[PDB]
Every structure is written in structure tokens, then in C-alpha cells.
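Q: A reviewer asked whether we had any structural model of the full assembly, not just the individual parts. We don't, so I'm hoping you can provide one. Inputs are below.
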Amino acid sequence: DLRPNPGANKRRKRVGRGPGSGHGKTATRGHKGQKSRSGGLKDPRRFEGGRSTTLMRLPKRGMQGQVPGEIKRPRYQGVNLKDLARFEGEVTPELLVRAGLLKKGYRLKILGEGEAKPLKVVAHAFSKSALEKLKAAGGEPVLLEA
Amino acid sequence: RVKMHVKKGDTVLVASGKYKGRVGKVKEVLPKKYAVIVEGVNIVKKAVRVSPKYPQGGFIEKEAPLHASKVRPICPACGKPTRVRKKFLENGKKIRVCAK
Amino acid sequence: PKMKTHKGAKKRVKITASGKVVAMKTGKRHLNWQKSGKEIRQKGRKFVLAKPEAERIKLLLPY
Amino acid sequence: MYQIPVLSPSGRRELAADLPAEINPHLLWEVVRWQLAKRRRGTASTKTRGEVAYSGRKIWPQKHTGRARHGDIGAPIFVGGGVVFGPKPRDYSYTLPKKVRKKGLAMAVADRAREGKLLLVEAFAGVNGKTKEFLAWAKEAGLDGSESVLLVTGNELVRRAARNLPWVVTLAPEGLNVYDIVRTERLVMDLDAWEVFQNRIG
RNA sequence: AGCAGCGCCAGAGAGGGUGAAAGCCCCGUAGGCGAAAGGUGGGGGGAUAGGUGAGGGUACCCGAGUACCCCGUGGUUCGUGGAGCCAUGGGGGAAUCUGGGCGGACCACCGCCUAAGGCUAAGUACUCCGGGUGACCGAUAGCGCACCAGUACCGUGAGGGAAAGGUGAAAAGAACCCCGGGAGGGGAGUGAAAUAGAGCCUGAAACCGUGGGCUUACAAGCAGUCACGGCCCCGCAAGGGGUUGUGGCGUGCCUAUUGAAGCAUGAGCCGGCGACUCACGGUCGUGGGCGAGCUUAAGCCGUUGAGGCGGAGGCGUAGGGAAACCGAG
RNA sequence: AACCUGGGGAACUGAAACAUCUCAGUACCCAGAGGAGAGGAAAGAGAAAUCGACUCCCUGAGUAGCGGCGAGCGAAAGGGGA
Ligand SMILES: [Mg+2]
Ligand SMILES: [Mg+2]
Ligand SMILES: [Mg+2]
Ligand SMILES: [Mg+2]
Ligand SMILES: [Mg+2]
Ligand SMILES: [Mg+2]
Ligand SMILES: [Mg+2]
Ligand SMILES: [Mg+2]
Ligand SMILES: [Mg+2]
Ligand SMILES: [Mg+2]
Ligand SMILES: [Mg+2]
Ligand SMILES: [Mg+2]
Ligand SMILES: [Mg+2]
Ligand SMILES: [Mg+2]
Ligand SMILES: [Mg+2]
Ligand SMILES: [Mg+2]
Ligand SMILES: [Mg+2]
Ligand SMILES: [Mg+2]
Ligand SMILES: [Mg+2]
Ligand SMILES: [Mg+2]
Ligand SMILES: [Mg+2]
Ligand SMILES: [Mg+2]
Ligand SMILES: [Mg+2]
Ligand SMILES: [Mg+2]
Ligand SMILES: [Mg+2]
Ligand SMILES: [Mg+2]
Ligand SMILES: [Mg+2]
Ligand SMILES: [Mg+2]
Ligand SMILES: [Mg+2]
Ligand SMILES: [Mg+2]
Ligand SMILES: [Mg+2]
Ligand SMILES: [Mg+2]
Ligand SMILES: [Mg+2]
Ligand SMILES: [Mg+2]
Ligand SMILES: [Mg+2]
Ligand SMILES: [Mg+2]
Ligand SMILES: [Mg+2]
Ligand SMILES: [Mg+2]
Ligand SMILES: [Mg+2]
Ligand SMILES: [Mg+2]
Ligand SMILES: [Mg+2]
Ligand SMILES: [Mg+2]
Ligand SMILES: [Mg+2]
Ligand SMILES: [Mg+2]
Ligand SMILES: [Mg+2]
Ligand SMILES: [Mg+2]
Ligand SMILES: [Mg+2]
Ligand SMILES: [Mg+2]
Ligand SMILES: [Mg+2]
Ligand SMILES: [Mg+2]
Ligand SMILES: [Mg+2]
Ligand SMILES: [Mg+2]
Ligand SMILES: [Mg+2]
Ligand SMILES: [Mg+2]
Ligand SMILES: [Mg+2]
Ligand SMILES: [Mg+2]
Ligand SMILES: [Mg+2]
Ligand SMILES: [Mg+2]
Ligand SMILES: [Mg+2]
Ligand SMILES: [Mg+2]
Ligand SMILES: [Mg+2]
Ligand SMILES: [Mg+2]
Ligand SMILES: [Mg+2]
Ligand SMILES: [Mg+2]
Ligand SMILES: [Mg+2]
Ligand SMILES: [Mg+2]
Ligand SMILES: [Mg+2]
Ligand SMILES: [Mg+2]
Ligand SMILES: [Mg+2]
Ligand SMILES: [Mg+2]
Ligand SMILES: [Mg+2]
Ligand SMILES: [Mg+2]
Ligand SMILES: [Mg+2]
Ligand SMILES: [Mg+2]
Ligand SMILES: [Mg+2]
Ligand SMILES: [Mg+2]
Ligand SMILES: [Mg+2]
Ligand SMILES: [Mg+2]
Ligand SMILES: [Mg+2]
Ligand SMILES: [Mg+2]
Ligand SMILES: [Mg+2]
Ligand SMILES: [Mg+2]
Ligand SMILES: [Mg+2]
Ligand SMILES: [Mg+2]
Ligand SMILES: [Mg+2]
Ligand SMILES: [Mg+2]
Ligand SMILES: [Mg+2]
Ligand SMILES: [Mg+2]
Ligand SMILES: [Mg+2]
Ligand SMILES: [Mg+2]
Ligand SMILES: [Mg+2]
Ligand SMILES: [Mg+2]
Ligand SMILES: [Mg+2]
Ligand SMILES: [Mg+2]
Ligand SMILES: [Mg+2]
Ligand SMILES: [Mg+2]
Ligand SMILES: [Mg+2]
Ligand SMILES: [Mg+2]
Ligand SMILES: [Mg+2]
Ligand SMILES: [Mg+2]
Ligand SMILES: [Mg+2]
Ligand SMILES: [Mg+2]
Ligand SMILES: [Mg+2]
Ligand SMILES: [Mg+2]
Ligand SMILES: [Mg+2]
Ligand SMILES: [Mg+2]
Ligand SMILES: [Mg+2]
Ligand SMILES: [Mg+2]
Ligand SMILES: [Mg+2]
Ligand SMILES: [Mg+2]
Ligand SMILES: [Mg+2]
Ligand SMILES: [Mg+2]
Ligand SMILES: [Mg+2]
Ligand SMILES: [Mg+2]
Ligand SMILES: [Mg+2]
Ligand SMILES: [Mg+2]
Ligand SMILES: [Mg+2]
Ligand SMILES: [Mg+2]
Ligand SMILES: [Mg+2]
Ligand SMILES: [Mg+2]
Ligand SMILES: [Mg+2]
Ligand SMILES: [Mg+2]
Ligand SMILES: [Mg+2]
Ligand SMILES: [Mg+2]
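A: Here is a predicted structure for the entire assembly that you could use as a starting point for your response.
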């Protein structure tokens, strides 16, 4: 294979449009033709009408903030036992983060749909319904404590 | 500095153009313009003279300078490049495969 | 560089898991005085928007 | 394909390989583009109406002057004035996905091998950095020089050889890049270098 | 130095120059040497300054207008907020380890750290200066300055601030004669070339002129177009070129406007300069890699137009609720 | 030349008016340092019976939070590096 004919396979096409020409996009810009098309219109996405923005809706969100900021609290990662049943051996937070769906998330909590393979599953929390599937063919190793 | 180059005042061959092949002693070497005076390129100046003193100056076809690249030094064997060998003390220049 | 999330709109609008935008019913805090029990109840729940829904999406983008 | 030609003092024992079959022309291109774009250097720069020697004083009143209407000379409509959207320096590189870097690499080699040009040598009579030697070795190697050759090898002496030779491009083992591969007609690489090529992919 | 013939070097086939297109002609390049003198120099070595302990009693010392409190303010993401911490202009004003500050009012609990004296290299920033490299510019560009430019010129001054590059390979730069006061020409002469002859390569356009062809003094016009005829011009003819006599038809270009030939805007004419870009983030589409996974950032190693390493981190695999919490709900 | 540190410190502009706010501790005036300057061995961080001077980069994160809760503004711990 030589340097000729590796070119983009018929769809890269850096065909950017040129607005000053005389045919296509002409006198005025691509689109324009009027006024307040010249340097920049307000936002306008979230913003402009000139009237009360749609900001008429209201902040229910409580706890929306506080001076010192956020409170350090344990974060539980929902991990379904359907993907858990995928591999087999002895599932612990170590494994699920080493490769899977933990991502250093503070805590592990298996739960939900899927069918439970037989094995010890060490987690920090179990859904009531999740405890059933694994109980019906496995061990329920709860979290730490100290 | 570094202005130095090929040969000096001695015997040399001319591999130029209008005077290709010719051979002769280089009577002058001006390093500034990187040209040397041999006996080849000699053109006829019509001028009486630039300075009024001495009425008759010469329609002389005197020697015209020549780019120091078209001329090559020479020895027993005709036309040779220039190697250099440090003597038992000084610094002499041997030719392609001989001495001086 | 790096669009900033519009805090004012995050503080009052949650985007659904699909792509819809929800918020609380307007006019339930002040005008109140004595409105049909229907009203104050109808005003408790949240709703979906329409076109500007897409407008507000374009703010909480990193969010 | 599989069976690659191998060269050694003992003879032409043709071995085999594991390189893929399907060659995506486009993918290859992306990688070649990526190499050529990363090497670019955004050295091209021009001075904006801002960065330019001229003053700031308004040149005329703009009223009952009868002249046109202007500010400072630095304005872009003012021969000598600042440039409009003139190029500033900027980086032309990007992070092409690693998976692809490997893909292309294999596919390049594979391609060159499928044409039957990939020769895995081993014997090198070229003792020292002497072009003559390599010129001889290559002569008996089937490399008359009628074909550009990407000589890949760990030995820096073998480098010395083909180094100056025009119709050849020396290169280290890790230097393997689809550009230089595709660039040349023939590919010749030491078995020890084929092992390290095998390490990245094999 | 092209082309043909026969050779050769290459740890050097980067590049530049030589009358045009040279690895081997010249300067270089690869590779390799080199400092009496000045500068630099813990990288290697040497020396000195300095520093190094266990258990018990005593409770002497451990940085003061300081801590701390209050009034006024500053800094921080913190706009007086529930407002701490740090800093301090004003007033009050301690203790030395049962001392004292902090962990976002305050209190108790648990833990952290020792204020009110000072010094400390490296990693970091920049580029007047030197060098290297460019999908950087090529004299309206590029620095304001390729050229004796921060000049000429302008302004009381601060300050403003230009224009202006190129004979040829070599000056061989045109002796001598002729016209002319000179300038400038005409011969002669140099040169491959002189409409390359000296602000001299190329030498476009507007604009001025000389010669020739068609044409015009009863004619009405956005200057053209369609037709026929005549005159001149290339071809033997068929054809084609130029010009315009008569007939038909016919309201400039742009802008702006409901509407312009418009007595609405802009434009003396030519040449050159001149306006939708890039960076980061976003959203849709599209080409391709991989797939319940996908992907790296600084940086390190390599290279000197080579890549590789680096999973920290990001997006995705679960949602719902203000939240506690619960979870295929 | 620029970089740096301290003392002093704007307005246009944004908010589609404007006064808090923004522009910005930017522009600039001033004093001082040097091949750098600043900072620097905890009366620290802040929730881990954890970390262990300082600076610089990546990240954390447009998160936490600040805000005529408008326009906007925007940390730190921790993790990867020099
Ligand atoms: Mg079009
Ligand atoms: Mg638009
Ligand atoms: Mg504007
Ligand atoms: Mg505007
Ligand atoms: Mg507007
Ligand atoms: Mg209104
Ligand atoms: Mg004399
Ligand atoms: Mg005479
Ligand atoms: Mg749904
Ligand atoms: Mg209320
Ligand atoms: Mg009421
Ligand atoms: Mg009722
Ligand atoms: Mg209710
Ligand atoms: Mg995020
Ligand atoms: Mg300026
Ligand atoms: Mg100036
Ligand atoms: Mg101005
Ligand atoms: Mg001004
Ligand atoms: Mg006026
Ligand atoms: Mg006028
Ligand atoms: Mg201009
Ligand atoms: Mg200029
Ligand atoms: Mg000018
Ligand atoms: Mg300029
Ligand atoms: Mg990298
Ligand atoms: Mg080569
Ligand atoms: Mg030819
Ligand atoms: Mg080289
Ligand atoms: Mg050639
Ligand atoms: Mg050459
Ligand atoms: Mg050298
Ligand atoms: Mg020496
Ligand atoms: Mg030495
Ligand atoms: Mg010294
Ligand atoms: Mg010394
Ligand atoms: Mg020394
Ligand atoms: Mg040192
Ligand atoms: Mg000692
Ligand atoms: Mg001892
Ligand atoms: Mg005691
Ligand atoms: Mg005591
Ligand atoms: Mg005492
Ligand atoms: Mg005492
Ligand atoms: Mg004191
Ligand atoms: Mg306090
Ligand atoms: Mg404040
Ligand atoms: Mg405060
Ligand atoms: Mg502040
Ligand atoms: Mg601030
Ligand atoms: Mg307030
Ligand atoms: Mg005080
Ligand atoms: Mg005491
Ligand atoms: Mg005491
Ligand atoms: Mg005491
Ligand atoms: Mg004690
Ligand atoms: Mg005591
Ligand atoms: Mg507390
Ligand atoms: Mg305790
Ligand atoms: Mg503490
Ligand atoms: Mg102390
Ligand atoms: Mg340093
Ligand atoms: Mg420099
Ligand atoms: Mg010019
Ligand atoms: Mg010009
Ligand atoms: Mg100069
Ligand atoms: Mg000069
Ligand atoms: Mg002037
Ligand atoms: Mg004057
Ligand atoms: Mg001026
Ligand atoms: Mg010339
Ligand atoms: Mg001259
Ligand atoms: Mg000259
Ligand atoms: Mg003359
Ligand atoms: Mg003549
Ligand atoms: Mg002539
Ligand atoms: Mg003449
Ligand atoms: Mg002419
Ligand atoms: Mg000419
Ligand atoms: Mg003449
Ligand atoms: Mg003259
Ligand atoms: Mg020329
Ligand atoms: Mg004229
Ligand atoms: Mg005239
Ligand atoms: Mg008429
Ligand atoms: Mg005929
Ligand atoms: Mg015809
Ligand atoms: Mg007519
Ligand atoms: Mg209209
Ligand atoms: Mg008119
Ligand atoms: Mg008018
Ligand atoms: Mg008007
Ligand atoms: Mg107009
Ligand atoms: Mg006019
Ligand atoms: Mg005009
Ligand atoms: Mg970014
Ligand atoms: Mg983008
Ligand atoms: Mg959409
Ligand atoms: Mg895309
Ligand atoms: Mg397809
Ligand atoms: Mg990967
Ligand atoms: Mg980054
Ligand atoms: Mg190493
Ligand atoms: Mg390196
Ligand atoms: Mg190289
Ligand atoms: Mg999610
Ligand atoms: Mg369900
Ligand atoms: Mg203001
Ligand atoms: Mg407003
Ligand atoms: Mg106003
Ligand atoms: Mg501020
Ligand atoms: Mg200040
Ligand atoms: Mg330093
Ligand atoms: Mg320092
Ligand atoms: Mg210091
Ligand atoms: Mg300090
Ligand atoms: Mg200090
Ligand atoms: Mg700190
Ligand atoms: Mg930095
Ligand atoms: Mg980022
Ligand atoms: Mg704030
Ligand atoms: Mg603020
Ligand atoms: Mg600010
Ligand atoms: Mg950190
Ligand atoms: Mg660190």
C-alpha cells in the first residue's frame, strides 16, 4: 500500500462553508439579512425575552446550600446482581472496583433484577429483595462496622 | 576570519567556462569577493581612466577577477583536491595523493 | 471556556432520567389566602415543560 | 496473512505469523494523518489590530471633515494595519485512540507482508558502520535498491550502513509507525525487532 | 552542475555556492580533536562549621500591649449570613504546659497543633541577548524600521511617525566621432541579452501619444442587442474577424425599500489591501475504533519530523425523593 | 524587554436602565528583589483513631458554595506527577 489512495473513505469531507462569495451565501452572512445580527444577540437560550424570564418557576430544592458547604456522608453505589452473576467466585468491593461498576464509590450495595449465582457476596448493604435472590443459593456477607 | 579558502599565489587550473581547461599562475587572490586573478578571464575595458592624472590610461584588456571556485590547484599530476597533513612540527598541505 | 452550569436553574429544575425537565407548580406560596382545596392540591405536584424544556437543558449540561 | 519469509545463514526457512487479513484503508489513513498532525508546529503567527506599533489617537474628528470615517490606523482596513483573523500559534495534535494506533500498525505490516515484501532477516555480514558492507549484504539479500526499504533493527551499526544510503530508511524497533511503513515499498526487519513488534502486537 | 559514457565515497545523499538542474568542484555535513587566559562548576573527591543517648526528682523557662473579648474592616467560594478561620485601625487586657490556638455561632465530649523572632536550595515565571526549527511572511506582507529609522517630517511639549529593496555571470558601466551650452540622443564598442544602459529583471491597468482599417456634419441618446446591407482583413469556396448604414427592441450597478432609471445611498478611473476565525466547553449529524464497557491527564522513557508508557481521573452500567431512606422501583 | 513582590488603585463595560454586584485587585502610579521573585518545616489540613514544609503541573470541578440566589463569581481536602 502506497501513500496515494489512503484518503478519508468518502465522508470525512472538511467542506466548511464560506459566507463571503457571491453565490451560495452572499451579500449578507450565511443567514442574517436584518439587524441585531451583527456582533451577538443576548443569550438567548436560557435568557432573553426582555420580560420575566421563564424563571417564574420556583426553587423547591431544599438543602440547596449552607456556608461551610457539603456534609461528608457515605455514598452507596447501586450494583445489580445481574451483572454480579456474570463472573463467579467471591464478589467483594475489591473486585467490583478493580473492574466493574464501583469506581472508588464509598460503599457497595447489591440489589435488584437478575438471577443470583451461588457465592459469597460481601457488600455494605443489601436490598430486601436482593437478600432473597442470594439467600436462595449463597451467603450474605454484610459490611464492616468500625 | 574563516574567509580563507582553496589556493593562494601559485600554479592553478581553470575549470570555469570561457576559459575552461586553461592553466596558469594566480597573480592575485582577493578574499573579500572570494575571487582570484589568474590569466584567464581578461576583458577589454574601453575606459580612458577614472582619474584625470596620467592622461593615457589604457583600452587595456587586463585580467578580470574570477570566482575562486572554478580554479583548482595542481601538481605533478593534473588538477587535484587538497588534503592536509601536519608535518613533524608545522602544518603542510598534501594533494590528492602526493606532496605539496 | 468550560460552560458554567446555570445555578439559578439547577436550584429549581431537575431533569428526568429520560430527557424531560421537571419543576414545581407556580403560584402556591403567595397568592394563597383561600383557594379551592383542588387548587392548592393541584399545585403540589410537579410537571413537564415543552420547547423551553430544551432551552433549560442547555444550561445544566455538565450537570 | 500468515507464512512470512525469513532469512538466515542456514537458508530461507519460511516461518509464519498471526497478523490479521482485513485491511481498512480509511483507518490506516486516520493514523497517518494523526502522525503528520502531531508533528506540525503552530509556529505561524500574525499581529492583531491590538498588537501593533501604531497609536490609538483618532485620526480625524468624524464630522464636517468630509473625509471618510476612522479611528486608529491599526484598524484592519488600513494597509499596514492589524490583521483580521490572522493565524496565531496553536497545537495541531490530538490523542488518537490507542486501540487504533495498534490496529493500523498491524494492518500496515500485514499489508506489506501480504504483498510479500516483509522479509524477516537475521544474518548481517555488515560487521561495522560501513556502507559498502551493507550494500553487498543487501545485494545478495535481493535488495538491488529498485525499491525503497524500511530497515528496522536494534543494531546501531546496521543503522550506520543503510543510514546514508538514499533508497533506504533506517529505524529503531519502537520506531515502527504506519507512516514510514506505508511510505516505503519494501519492509525488512530483524527477528529480534520482530519480537518487540510482536510485544506491542502479535 | 543538463544530456550520453565509464567510475568512485558514504558513521558524510542536511543545506548553501559555483555563468543553468553537482553526494565525488567550493563552503559544509557524518564522525572526531582542541585552551596558555577569563568565566562557570559539589557532577566527582577532600576538608572544616555543626550535630547525635537512657531513667528519676525539681516545676525555673518556653517570644506581650501579644493571645483573648468588643467596635470598624480586609482576605477566602463566603455580598452580615447561623459567620468560624486568617489579618488588624480603636478600647479593655492574660497565662507558660492544671499553659494556649483549631476542627464554621455557642456548650460538653473526642482528636489536632504549639502563635506573638529569623533563614533555607530544587521543581516555577519571563526573553533584552545567542542558537536551532517552521504544512510562518516574502517588500501594501513580515517588526514602525530587509534600505544609515524611532530617522525625515509633525507638535511648545508629552507624543506622533512615513516612504524608500532587485543591471549583469563579470562593470566588462559604453573610449572615440557626430548634434547640442548642457540634458539628451545618433553611430561605434561590451555583453548571451542593452525596449538588461544605471533608481537599469520581469514590466500588468488606468492614463497620454504616432501610424493604419471601418466609420460620422437632417441628427434624439443607460450607448447595448437582434437583422440586412456596404467597406477592409485572414481562407480556393463554405466560413470567420473588424467596422457601422438603416430597421426592430431596450429605464445604469449596489444599497435600502411596499415601492428606484430614478431628481433616495455609495462609487473620478486602474492596480494592490480589506470583513464569519481560533481556543476551551456544548449540542445534532457523520466516518471510523472498541463495547458493558470506552478512554486517558500531567508526567516518565525513547526519538530529534517515532513512538511507547502512564488509569490518577472522566463518561457509561439505576432510579426516585427536598431529605433521612429506599431501590426496579 | 518581560517575569516577580509589596504599598496605593480606576472607569468604560456586563447586569440588555441602575445604585449592591461585575469589569478587577485588572489597567495604571509607587517602593523593592533578582537571575529570578514569592513561599517554606504546622498554634496546618479535617473526619480517615488519616495525612505530614513550600512552590509548580494534571485532577478533584464548573463540584462544594457565594450571589440585587440577577448578571455572574467559584474554592479546598483527597488522588496522579515535578
Ligand atoms: Mg449554496
Ligand atoms: Mg447565526
Ligand atoms: Mg462588537
Ligand atoms: Mg452587540
Ligand atoms: Mg439584541
Ligand atoms: Mg418588564
Ligand atoms: Mg604616480
Ligand atoms: Mg587613447
Ligand atoms: Mg420512560
Ligand atoms: Mg414561606
Ligand atoms: Mg392573603
Ligand atoms: Mg373545598
Ligand atoms: Mg398535602
Ligand atoms: Mg462531572
Ligand atoms: Mg493599542
Ligand atoms: Mg509608534
Ligand atoms: Mg481605540
Ligand atoms: Mg484614548
Ligand atoms: Mg456627525
Ligand atoms: Mg462629501
Ligand atoms: Mg490592512
Ligand atoms: Mg508601514
Ligand atoms: Mg504607512
Ligand atoms: Mg503588520
Ligand atoms: Mg503524551
Ligand atoms: Mg536515508
Ligand atoms: Mg531534462
Ligand atoms: Mg544527514
Ligand atoms: Mg537534477
Ligand atoms: Mg552541490
Ligand atoms: Mg563538526
Ligand atoms: Mg587548536
Ligand atoms: Mg578537553
Ligand atoms: Mg560564580
Ligand atoms: Mg570559582
Ligand atoms: Mg576549568
Ligand atoms: Mg549543580
Ligand atoms: Mg571535621
Ligand atoms: Mg550509645
Ligand atoms: Mg513526682
Ligand atoms: Mg506546676
Ligand atoms: Mg530558675
Ligand atoms: Mg526564675
Ligand atoms: Mg518582641
Ligand atoms: Mg479566635
Ligand atoms: Mg470581604
Ligand atoms: Mg469577612
Ligand atoms: Mg474579598
Ligand atoms: Mg475574590
Ligand atoms: Mg446582601
Ligand atoms: Mg487590635
Ligand atoms: Mg510565667
Ligand atoms: Mg514554669
Ligand atoms: Mg510558672
Ligand atoms: Mg505536660
Ligand atoms: Mg503551671
Ligand atoms: Mg464543630
Ligand atoms: Mg479516648
Ligand atoms: Mg488542626
Ligand atoms: Mg517558633
Ligand atoms: Mg527555583
Ligand atoms: Mg532570540
Ligand atoms: Mg513598494
Ligand atoms: Mg510592490
Ligand atoms: Mg536594519
Ligand atoms: Mg548597508
Ligand atoms: Mg509625516
Ligand atoms: Mg515645529
Ligand atoms: Mg498617528
Ligand atoms: Mg546578475
Ligand atoms: Mg554597481
Ligand atoms: Mg557590484
Ligand atoms: Mg545619456
Ligand atoms: Mg549601436
Ligand atoms: Mg545591441
Ligand atoms: Mg541603444
Ligand atoms: Mg511594449
Ligand atoms: Mg531584461
Ligand atoms: Mg539608452
Ligand atoms: Mg541618464
Ligand atoms: Mg537573474
Ligand atoms: Mg498620462
Ligand atoms: Mg494629461
Ligand atoms: Mg444619430
Ligand atoms: Mg489553396
Ligand atoms: Mg466554422
Ligand atoms: Mg439599432
Ligand atoms: Mg423587502
Ligand atoms: Mg440622474
Ligand atoms: Mg438626498
Ligand atoms: Mg439615507
Ligand atoms: Mg451603497
Ligand atoms: Mg457624491
Ligand atoms: Mg471609490
Ligand atoms: Mg477543558
Ligand atoms: Mg467543538
Ligand atoms: Mg437535542
Ligand atoms: Mg462525534
Ligand atoms: Mg457505514
Ligand atoms: Mg485502552
Ligand atoms: Mg489539562
Ligand atoms: Mg531510561
Ligand atoms: Mg527526552
Ligand atoms: Mg532523522
Ligand atoms: Mg447516572
Ligand atoms: Mg417494577
Ligand atoms: Mg460602574
Ligand atoms: Mg438585570
Ligand atoms: Mg444609561
Ligand atoms: Mg474582587
Ligand atoms: Mg490592596
Ligand atoms: Mg532556576
Ligand atoms: Mg528563590
Ligand atoms: Mg527565597
Ligand atoms: Mg517567606
Ligand atoms: Mg522570605
Ligand atoms: Mg498551603
Ligand atoms: Mg507553569
Ligand atoms: Mg479539564
Ligand atoms: Mg462569591
Ligand atoms: Mg465577588
Ligand atoms: Mg472576583
Ligand atoms: Mg493534592
Ligand atoms: Mg502530591
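A: Points you may want to mention in the reply: The longest helix of chain D spans residues 98-114. Residues 61 and 169 of chain D are 67 Å apart (CA to CA).
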